[PDB]
Design an enzyme around this catalytic site. Sequence first.
Site, PDB file in Angstrom:
ATOM      1  N   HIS A 108       0.782  -1.235   0.000  1.00 53.31           N
ATOM      2  CA  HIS A 108       0.000   0.000   0.000  1.00 53.31           C
ATOM      3  C   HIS A 108       0.812   1.281   0.000  1.00 53.31           C
ATOM      4  CE1 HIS A 108      -3.863  -2.157   1.578  1.00 53.31           C
ATOM      5  NE2 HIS A 108      -3.472  -2.572   0.386  1.00 53.31           N
ATOM      6  N   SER A 155      -0.678  -0.634  -6.471  1.00 52.65           N
ATOM      7  CA  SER A 155      -0.356  -1.677  -7.433  1.00 52.65           C
ATOM      8  C   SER A 155       0.338  -1.204  -8.700  1.00 52.65           C
ATOM      9  CB  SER A 155      -1.618  -2.424  -7.840  1.00 52.65           C
ATOM     10  OG  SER A 155      -2.202  -3.081  -6.736  1.00 52.65           O
ATOM     11  N   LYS A 212     -14.430  -8.270  -9.605  1.00 55.69           N
ATOM     12  CA  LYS A 212     -13.489  -8.981 -10.453  1.00 55.69           C
ATOM     13  C   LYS A 212     -12.843 -10.133  -9.691  1.00 55.69           C
ATOM     14  CE  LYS A 212      -9.459  -8.204 -13.472  1.00 55.69           C
ATOM     15  NZ  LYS A 212     -10.096  -8.642 -14.758  1.00 55.69           N
ATOM     16  N   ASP A 213     -12.497  -9.885  -8.433  1.00 56.54           N
ATOM     17  CA  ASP A 213     -11.864 -10.905  -7.604  1.00 56.54           C
ATOM     18  C   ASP A 213     -12.823 -12.021  -7.191  1.00 56.54           C
ATOM     19  OD1 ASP A 213      -9.297  -8.936  -5.795  1.00 56.54           O
ATOM     20  OD2 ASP A 213      -9.612  -9.368  -7.918  1.00 56.54           O
ATOM     21  N   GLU A 216       5.599 -33.863  -3.761  1.00 58.79           N
ATOM     22  CA  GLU A 216       4.346 -33.473  -4.366  1.00 58.79           C
ATOM     23  C   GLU A 216       4.730 -32.656  -5.581  1.00 58.79           C
ATOM     24  OE1 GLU A 216       0.817 -33.711  -3.367  1.00 58.79           O
ATOM     25  OE2 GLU A 216       1.891 -35.543  -2.761  1.00 58.79           O
TER      26      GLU A 216
HETATM   27  C1  HEM Z   1       0.632 -16.439   1.167  1.00 60.55           C
HETATM   28  C2  HEM Z   1       1.169 -15.689  -0.034  1.00 60.55           C
HETATM   29  C3  HEM Z   1       0.896 -14.409  -0.491  1.00 60.55           C
HETATM   30  C4  HEM Z   1      -0.163 -13.630  -0.222  1.00 60.55           C
HETATM   31  C5  HEM Z   1      -1.375 -13.970   0.621  1.00 60.55           C
HETATM   32  C6  HEM Z   1       0.004 -12.465  -1.103  1.00 60.55           C
HETATM   33  C7  HEM Z   1      -0.951 -11.473  -1.289  1.00 60.55           C
HETATM   34  C8  HEM Z   1      -0.834 -10.442  -2.189  1.00 60.55           C
HETATM   35  C9  HEM Z   1      -1.941  -9.555  -2.485  1.00 60.55           C
HETATM   36  C10 HEM Z   1      -3.378  -9.666  -1.986  1.00 60.55           C
HETATM   37  C11 HEM Z   1      -1.469  -8.631  -3.353  1.00 60.55           C
HETATM   38  C12 HEM Z   1      -2.358  -7.594  -4.074  1.00 60.55           C
HETATM   39  C13 HEM Z   1      -3.090  -8.136  -5.327  1.00 60.55           C
HETATM   40  C14 HEM Z   1      -2.123  -8.678  -6.401  1.00 60.55           C
HETATM   41  O1  HEM Z   1      -1.291  -7.895  -6.939  1.00 60.55           O
HETATM   42  O2  HEM Z   1      -2.190  -9.893  -6.703  1.00 60.55           O
HETATM   43  C15 HEM Z   1      -0.044  -8.982  -3.560  1.00 60.55           C
HETATM   44  C16 HEM Z   1       0.817  -8.254  -4.325  1.00 60.55           C
HETATM   45  C17 HEM Z   1       2.153  -8.540  -4.555  1.00 60.55           C
HETATM   46  N1  HEM Z   1       2.775  -9.666  -4.060  1.00 60.55           N
HETATM   47 FE1  HEM Z   1       1.983 -11.133  -2.973  1.00 60.55          FE
HETATM   48  N2  HEM Z   1       1.206 -12.501  -1.828  1.00 60.55           N
HETATM   49  C18 HEM Z   1       1.749 -13.692  -1.473  1.00 60.55           C
HETATM   50  C19 HEM Z   1       3.021 -14.076  -1.894  1.00 60.55           C
HETATM   51  C20 HEM Z   1       3.902 -13.329  -2.657  1.00 60.55           C
HETATM   52  C21 HEM Z   1       5.130 -13.849  -3.224  1.00 60.55           C
HETATM   53  C22 HEM Z   1       5.648 -15.261  -3.038  1.00 60.55           C
HETATM   54  C23 HEM Z   1       5.685 -12.857  -4.012  1.00 60.55           C
HETATM   55  C24 HEM Z   1       6.861 -12.851  -4.764  1.00 60.55           C
HETATM   56  C25 HEM Z   1       8.113 -13.535  -4.343  1.00 60.55           C
HETATM   57  C26 HEM Z   1       4.761 -11.765  -3.905  1.00 60.55           C
HETATM   58  C27 HEM Z   1       4.976 -10.581  -4.544  1.00 60.55           C
HETATM   59  C28 HEM Z   1       4.059  -9.583  -4.597  1.00 60.55           C
HETATM   60  C29 HEM Z   1       4.289  -8.341  -5.235  1.00 60.55           C
HETATM   61  C30 HEM Z   1       5.672  -7.842  -5.692  1.00 60.55           C
HETATM   62  C31 HEM Z   1       3.090  -7.720  -5.344  1.00 60.55           C
HETATM   63  C32 HEM Z   1       2.836  -6.462  -6.171  1.00 60.55           C
HETATM   64  C33 HEM Z   1       1.775  -6.649  -7.254  1.00 60.55           C
HETATM   65  C34 HEM Z   1       1.842  -5.578  -8.347  1.00 60.55           C
HETATM   66  O3  HEM Z   1       2.754  -5.633  -9.204  1.00 60.55           O
HETATM   67  O4  HEM Z   1       0.985  -4.669  -8.347  1.00 60.55           O
HETATM   68  N3  HEM Z   1       3.632 -12.093  -3.143  1.00 60.55           N
HETATM   69  N4  HEM Z   1       0.300 -10.145  -2.926  1.00 60.55           N
HETATM   70  C1  AZO Z   2       8.126 -34.632   4.445  1.00 62.41           C
HETATM   71  O1  AZO Z   2       8.263 -34.737   3.050  1.00 62.41           O
HETATM   72  C2  AZO Z   2       7.290 -33.926   2.450  1.00 62.41           C
HETATM   73  C3  AZO Z   2       7.312 -33.967   0.942  1.00 62.41           C
HETATM   74  C4  AZO Z   2       6.427 -33.241   0.287  1.00 62.41           C
HETATM   75  O2  AZO Z   2       6.390 -33.242  -0.942  1.00 62.41           O
HETATM   76  O3  AZO Z   2       5.479 -32.429   1.028  1.00 62.41           O
HETATM   77  C5  AZO Z   2       4.512 -31.632   0.354  1.00 62.41           C
HETATM   78  C6  AZO Z   2       8.328 -34.829   0.231  1.00 62.41           C
HETATM   79  C7  AZO Z   2       7.978 -36.130  -0.224  1.00 62.41           C
HETATM   80  C8  AZO Z   2       8.958 -36.938  -0.883  1.00 62.41           C
HETATM   81  C9  AZO Z   2      10.290 -36.475  -1.099  1.00 62.41           C
HETATM   82  C10 AZO Z   2      10.681 -35.196  -0.670  1.00 62.41           C
HETATM   83  C11 AZO Z   2       9.741 -34.338  -0.004  1.00 62.41           C
HETATM   84  O4  AZO Z   2      10.102 -33.086   0.429  1.00 62.41           O
HETATM   85  C12 AZO Z   2      10.644 -32.092  -0.382  1.00 62.41           C
HETATM   86  C13 AZO Z   2      10.977 -30.859   0.227  1.00 62.41           C
HETATM   87  C14 AZO Z   2      11.534 -29.854  -0.592  1.00 62.41           C
HETATM   88  O5  AZO Z   2      11.851 -28.666   0.005  1.00 62.41           O
HETATM   89  C15 AZO Z   2      12.398 -27.586  -0.637  1.00 62.41           C
HETATM   90  C16 AZO Z   2      11.711 -26.918  -1.717  1.00 62.41           C
HETATM   91  C17 AZO Z   2      12.322 -25.800  -2.333  1.00 62.41           C
HETATM   92  C18 AZO Z   2      13.609 -25.325  -1.893  1.00 62.41           C
HETATM   93  C19 AZO Z   2      14.334 -25.949  -0.827  1.00 62.41           C
HETATM   94  C20 AZO Z   2      13.762 -27.074  -0.182  1.00 62.41           C
HETATM   95  C21 AZO Z   2      14.465 -27.711   0.887  1.00 62.41           C
HETATM   96  N1  AZO Z   2      14.996 -28.246   1.743  1.00 62.41           N
HETATM   97  N2  AZO Z   2      11.741 -30.090  -1.937  1.00 62.41           N
HETATM   98  C22 AZO Z   2      11.416 -31.281  -2.518  1.00 62.41           C
HETATM   99  N3  AZO Z   2      10.875 -32.265  -1.746  1.00 62.41           N
END
Ligand code: HEM
Ligand code: AZO
Lengths: 80, 147, 241, 241, 379, 380
Positions: E201, E205, E227-228, E271
């Site tokens: 915020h 965005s 939209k969402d 997985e």
């Molecule tokens: C439990 C996971 C996450 C939640 C609940 C979350 C939630 C949100 C929400 C609600 C927004 C606003 C709407 C949207 O732009 O989609 C947002 C924006 C953003 N999130 Fe996440 N997010 C998550 C994970 C991440 C991850 C893993 C990344 C990247 C490594 C990330 C990067 C961003 C960025 C950079 C924005 C800006 C969007 C734009 O360009 O306007 N988020 N996220």
């Molecule tokens: C307890 O094992 C859980 C597993 C799983 O897939 O849970 C959803 C699993 C099952 C079989 C073999 C390995 C498993 O666990 C995992 C865990 C794992 O963890 C990472 C993912 C991305 C980056 C780093 C790691 C680490 N450490 N990356 C790949 N396999």
Amino acid sequence: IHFGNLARVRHIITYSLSPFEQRAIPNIFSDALPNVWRRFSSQVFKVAPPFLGAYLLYSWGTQEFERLKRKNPADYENDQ
Amino acid sequence: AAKNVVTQFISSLSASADVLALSKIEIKLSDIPEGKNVAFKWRGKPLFVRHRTQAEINQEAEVDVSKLRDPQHDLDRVKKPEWVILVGVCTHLGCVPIANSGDFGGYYCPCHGSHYDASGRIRKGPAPYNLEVPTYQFVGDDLVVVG
Amino acid sequence: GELELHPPAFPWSHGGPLSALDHSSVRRGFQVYKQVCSACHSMDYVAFRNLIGVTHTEAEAKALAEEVEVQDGPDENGELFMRPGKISDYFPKPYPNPEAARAANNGALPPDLSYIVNARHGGEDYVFSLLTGYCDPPAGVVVREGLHYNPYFPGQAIGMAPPIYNEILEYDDGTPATMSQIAKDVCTFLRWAAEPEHDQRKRMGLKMLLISALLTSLLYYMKRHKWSVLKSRKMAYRPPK
Amino acid sequence: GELELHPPAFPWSHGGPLSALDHSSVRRGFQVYKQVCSACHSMDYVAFRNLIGVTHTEAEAKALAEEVEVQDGPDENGELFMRPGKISDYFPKPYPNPEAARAANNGALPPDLSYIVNARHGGEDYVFSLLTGYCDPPAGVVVREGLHYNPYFPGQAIGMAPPIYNEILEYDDGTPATMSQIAKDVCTFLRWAAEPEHDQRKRMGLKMLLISALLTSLLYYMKRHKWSVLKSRKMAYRPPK
Amino acid sequence: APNIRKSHPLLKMINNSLIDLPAPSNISAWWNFGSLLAVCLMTQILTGLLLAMHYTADTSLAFSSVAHTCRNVQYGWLIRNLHANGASFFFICIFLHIGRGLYYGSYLYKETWNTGVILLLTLMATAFVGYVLPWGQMSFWGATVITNLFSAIPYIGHTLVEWAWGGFSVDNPTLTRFFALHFLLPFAIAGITIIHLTFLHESGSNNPLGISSDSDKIPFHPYYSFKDILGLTLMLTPFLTLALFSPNLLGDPENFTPANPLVTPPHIKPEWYFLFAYAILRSIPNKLGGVLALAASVLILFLIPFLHKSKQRTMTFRPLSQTLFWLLVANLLILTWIGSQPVEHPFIIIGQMASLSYFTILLILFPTIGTLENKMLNY
Amino acid sequence: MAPNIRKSHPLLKMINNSLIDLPAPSNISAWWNFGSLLAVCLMTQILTGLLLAMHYTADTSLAFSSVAHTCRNVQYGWLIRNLHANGASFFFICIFLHIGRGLYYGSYLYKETWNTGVILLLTLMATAFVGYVLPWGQMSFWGATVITNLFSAIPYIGHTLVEWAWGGFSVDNPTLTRFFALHFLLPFAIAGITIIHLTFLHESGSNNPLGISSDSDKIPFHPYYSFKDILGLTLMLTPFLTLALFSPNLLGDPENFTPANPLVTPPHIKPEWYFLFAYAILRSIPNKLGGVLALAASVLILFLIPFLHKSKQRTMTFRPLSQTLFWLLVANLLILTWIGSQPVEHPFIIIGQMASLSYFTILLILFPTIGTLENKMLNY
Ligand code: HEM
Ligand SMILES: CO/C=C(/C(=O)OC)c1ccccc1Oc1cc(Oc2ccccc2C#N)ncn1
Ligand code: HEC
Ligand code: HEC
Ligand code: HEM
Ligand code: HEM
Ligand code: HEM
Ligand SMILES: CO/C=C(/C(=O)OC)c1ccccc1Oc1cc(Oc2ccccc2C#N)ncn1
Ligand SMILES: CCCCCCCCO[C@@H]1O[C@H](CO)[C@@H](O)[C@H](O)[C@H]1O
Ligand SMILES: CCCCCCCCO[C@@H]1O[C@H](CO)[C@@H](O)[C@H](O)[C@H]1O
Ligand code: FES
């Protein structure tokens, strides 16, 4: 921002010393203790009473309870 | 959609199938002869089902309904005189009685005295009430379904 | 009916907040249990390894455990079988289940002693009083068959016959096994079985107090040092009056 | 040791996303299990009450459970004892533990069948192909004593001798007990044992889809209705120029 | 103040983030994943608690408590399904969320980006420990395989691992602490998510054209609330269709077998959402290098903000970057595929190629092509 | 953006406007030290809680022993167990002093801060209640049984709500497992609502012991109150640890060192000290339904305080009549606490009804009445 918007204050001067120029616990006997006593005195008859009253009620009720557990000889005076 | 999802989640918290499966028990009166008390396990606690003889059912009427802590005549407890079904738990502090023994030929709680008659009513002892009588009924001249 | 005799407060050597257990007494207490109480009382939460470095040697502990046959299994054919005890085994249960326990004690159930001194008000003072307090019922009182009169037990009729009497056993450390000596020792042992941390806990209390004393004074000074600025502060009202 | 045959995909009557189980087939499959597989295979997660309203009547279920003696206890003296089964009991285990199971099957262990169709790739197609796929080893291959050749089993040497053959039992519903008919039914039963929710799950899928179709269309229109304002919006740049 | 939606100390927060919050008028469907991730989280926590109320963390009861839940609890099977499959919906959504940000340079919002990486790491840990709970064969072996990797860290190797296990192998004391962790982490996720949105915020965005949208902003409601919501049902359909018509499509059948320490499954694989990392893991033959390569496969995300060379924010008007972007996405499908395959030829070499190109594209090509494109714009 | 990064940064800015540059009344006393202790108390319960949770097993057949295993085998398991169990009391002592202070200084005039506070108290009670069941000892099971059965007395939906909560027909394993889930969960809700509590609080800032505006004399939270509170932490922490280390079971029921047994009712089913006062009120009304309401009301009464303020002054500092009425109330609560620990017999029964009756009279009738009276004696 909460500092600077609080109150409209005028004509008040205040003087303060660095903590290193003064003592942390000054005049324990001439000022501190006297006041502690003063403070205790002024409150004792407001706090103490109900607590004393609670104590009495507690003592009575505890003793009255143990007393009702004892036996009254007046239930066996003619059980020959 | 919401109503359904909420309903399903809400009900996931009520009794599961394995639990309901032990909700109620059905006992065969034919297995219980007169003059002999039988106890089954119902809801983790003992369940008494005694076959009262026309003889014992009599000792019962001869009870001063107004001389017992939990004033109730056989009328209010059983359904079929020859059948008394109680929850085998003392009303005092949860122990399980001993049938046939005691000052009133009924049950005796070896914990603090509590003597219960043939109808399972507190006579002599610390227990406040009389052994509880759980819901139930009969099905055919040989089956009863408690619970 | 609601009358009950309360035990007195004996001066146990481990009663002081800073006083540990007399391990010599605990070692004896273990013997009593092992040779007397363990006949009817289980002690599910203690294992022979627990004795090591407390009352016994590691060799002594290993010996003590081997005196017992424990049920292990299944084997190749899915059969249960016996084996000598290891120090990882817990003290042996005298009966399989409570039903059998009662069966052998007139429907009475001798409780597990692992937490007894904490599962009873009075603790060791209670257990000691009880063990040494058996006597005959006063006038008007009748104890039903199978029960024994003990004024310290609630209801005064206990299902445990007096468990200990003079010389009922010999302390291999050469201590005069009088009945009270025995009860005193077994109670001390029971205190330990309920809380092995006892000594460490108290040692920790000592450090906690000293550091507490030190740290509190220090922080009092610092609080005062900082506030001194406001405490001594002076002000005046100077209107252009 | 390398190379594996993958079963084919049979057209089960419960394969369709909207198609339930043929409860008639399930009822028969239960018989197969009861009279054939239950001799070595446990099915720990199913109880007689589970059959009620699925394949059997409450009376039939109660009867089926009473044919079994279950071990209850302890009694007054802390003794175990037998008793006739209730519908709350689970299908009886053929052996006490796996050691005994192996002991009776040449060190081989017949697994619990409760989740077998999900614990194996292929599911019922696999179990069906396996049961009906026993044959003689090809040239160059020798099966060690006690093992039987099954191309469908990994390694091709299975410790389970062909369990079913024509007329090995009689369907009391008057169905021709051919070997494949049997395997077909028992597999259908196993699908059910793995997931009793199957039919309800599918019935729910139908409602989910319809409501999903309805609700998504509706929400698409609303989203569009609101955005229509920006979608059709027109703008112009009018400088004083 | 006139309306209570602005004055109140709480509604004011709900208003400045879900109602009167200024949003770009041109954000596309790729911006629908944040809200789905939020909803996804609320749903996992919900179904998770419902399952936790019937679970028992003990090696001797875990497997069957889960079975008891499916077989006896009213709709236990449904809840179990939804929770298990919800984990995948969560990851699908998160990869699309991450993709969107890489393609549109959202990572230039450094703090929002970094908290986002943290959310992903926490989400993984959560799913990892959650997976162990049913205590099936892949549950135990997965735990065993992965946790043993760390005994390879020099010195504090066996120490850190044995500490984590609470013993000498994955056993009961591990299960119980994993349950505590699995219950705990989602709440950390919810908390950090608040921070994520708080940093977000600060700027508002980003949008698909990567240029300032101050000239054309619209209120979050009703435009994006609608939209969402729509985007919710559009995704929720494939989700439920899977959880209701093909419950075990994504799961390993090996997990329908109680864990057994004396029987290694033939193919210990994760997985789907971890496969790509598992592939990179096995690409480096050498316990220590593989662990680092594994770690880096995700930690690499912290570097993205520093490898931006373009003079433009998004890849909308950058054709060379666009193909490099899709190469990357394809690269990841390959790694995912390799991860699910045994460690043999040709999979081994293909694996090392895809692992190697994965890092090359992010560390070398992206910043390079970006500079190149700057020259082709005469900048 | 701005000169120092303590104001510009979107996060530090928050830490600064609530723990450093936050304006605090220069004259707040030690009674204002309980909020921070409550916060620290909460962090500590959650911490020790998680450490115990990692060794606990929620199953009737393993609960009692999992806790014993923890105490007997886990390194410092005994210490953690002690700290967690005793921390619950430290928590309540602190909360009752926190509430007292607010009643005596009219802090409740900060309605939202006050109401979120009552919610914190209710959540804290539910937490401690379900946590108490986890060891599955005798008082664990019987307390659960006594209390949850009270609700089968609600009309029509009674038995239903109860059997739903139990997950069966009695307090059994399905109750334990859901109570563990709840016990793990609620503390986090407490932490969350606490943030709201402080958010509403910051809208006005702190009230002070003289009850008059302190805008003319405010000081930064740090170092004045960061130091005062840290000192306040060690001053309390000493009696705490002295208890947890020198008298571990002083406050606990010996009955809980016995595994739960559905077929053996303990002779005296009573709660932990911090619930006694309510237990007393419960038993004061013979009639299952009235008692339950009376119980509920004993705490819900706190939502009415903001509406019963009649004084023209905020605090009771300069209100002598209200001050004695205040200490009567406090004494009243010690009496109820005491009654709650006694059997239901004469003279305890009558004394119980008197204290329960005077409890509600004092809050509903006397306080507002004396307040008005005092307004007249100031010629207002
Ligand atoms: C439990 C996971 C996450 C939640 C609940 C979350 C939630 C949100 C929400 C609600 C927004 C606003 C709407 C949207 O732009 O989609 C947002 C924006 C953003 N999130 Fe996440 N997010 C998550 C994970 C991440 C991850 C893993 C990344 C990247 C490594 C990330 C990067 C961003 C960025 C950079 C924005 C800006 C969007 C734009 O360009 O306007 N988020 N996220
Ligand atoms: C307890 O094992 C859980 C597993 C799983 O897939 O849970 C959803 C699993 C099952 C079989 C073999 C390995 C498993 O666990 C995992 C865990 C794992 O963890 C990472 C993912 C991305 C980056 C780093 C790691 C680490 N450490 N990356 C790949 N396999
Ligand atoms: C013959 C078996 C037997 C022996 C040997 C025995 N006890 Fe007991 N003990 C019992 C029985 C039976 C009870 C049950 C008493 C009751 O509840 O009526 C009991 C109960 C107890 C209780 C008190 C129970 C209560 O509710 O307060 C304690 C403590 C106790 N024993 C201690 C010991 C100690 C110490 C020893 C060894 C010195 C010992 N016992 C030896 C049989 C025995
Ligand atoms: C004499 C006992 C016996 C009978 C009867 C029997 N099985 Fe088996 N079954 C086994 C044994 C032994 C194995 C173990 C095979 C191995 O692992 O080598 C086995 C294994 C299995 C397997 C496959 C194991 C795997 O790893 O793929 C299935 C499925 C199976 N049995 C199905 C059945 C069904 C269905 C029936 C009844 C039609 C049946 N069995 C009857 C003994 C039996
Ligand atoms: C970020 C959210 C969450 C994720 C990603 C997640 C993921 C998972 C995964 C991967 C599994 C294994 C699924 C399977 O059985 O195959 C699982 C199981 C489980 N989760 Fe979660 N979970 C989440 C939140 C929670 C929460 C908050 C709770 C409840 C406090 C919880 C309780 C459980 C329980 C009881 C299980 C074991 C039973 C089962 O396997 O179905 N989870 N979770
Ligand atoms: C988990 C419990 C709680 C936490 C962590 C908490 C924390 C705090 C904190 C840190 C403050 C500021 C410092 C102070 O004035 O002591 C505060 C103030 C306050 N709290 Fe609480 N509180 C809790 C429960 C309650 C309860 C139960 C009430 C009353 C029902 C309440 C009423 C108030 C009020 C009215 C203030 C204003 C103090 C003033 O007059 O300046 N709080 N609380
Ligand atoms: C608001 C904070 C909390 C309060 C008031 C609290 C209170 C309690 C109480 C009263 C007990 C029983 C103490 C006894 O054994 O006599 C208990 C037990 C327990 N608590 Fe907490 N607790 C809190 C937070 C937590 C949290 C966050 C966890 C961990 C997720 C937790 C896990 C446990 C466990 C495992 C037990 C059972 C073991 C034991 O009896 O010591 N607690 N708690
Ligand atoms: C599970 O029982 C837990 C108890 C406990 O004290 O936990 C800390 C407990 C033990 C023995 C007897 C009762 C017990 O529970 C309780 C619970 C209780 O809850 C309330 C407190 C204030 C206002 C309303 C209620 C309710 N209901 N008030 C008094 N005792
Ligand atoms: C107010 C701050 C109090 C902190 C007190 C720290 C004292 C803890 O000291 C403890 O003493 C035990 C017995 O020797 C040792 O076994 C522990 O390892 C040690 O940490
Ligand atoms: C995207 C929204 C999907 C919502 C789908 C709701 C369908 C749930 O419908 C369910 O069907 C079962 C079988 O008939 C019944 O037993 C349940 O009670 C009912 O709630
Ligand atoms: S429990 Fe039956 S007489 Fe006391």
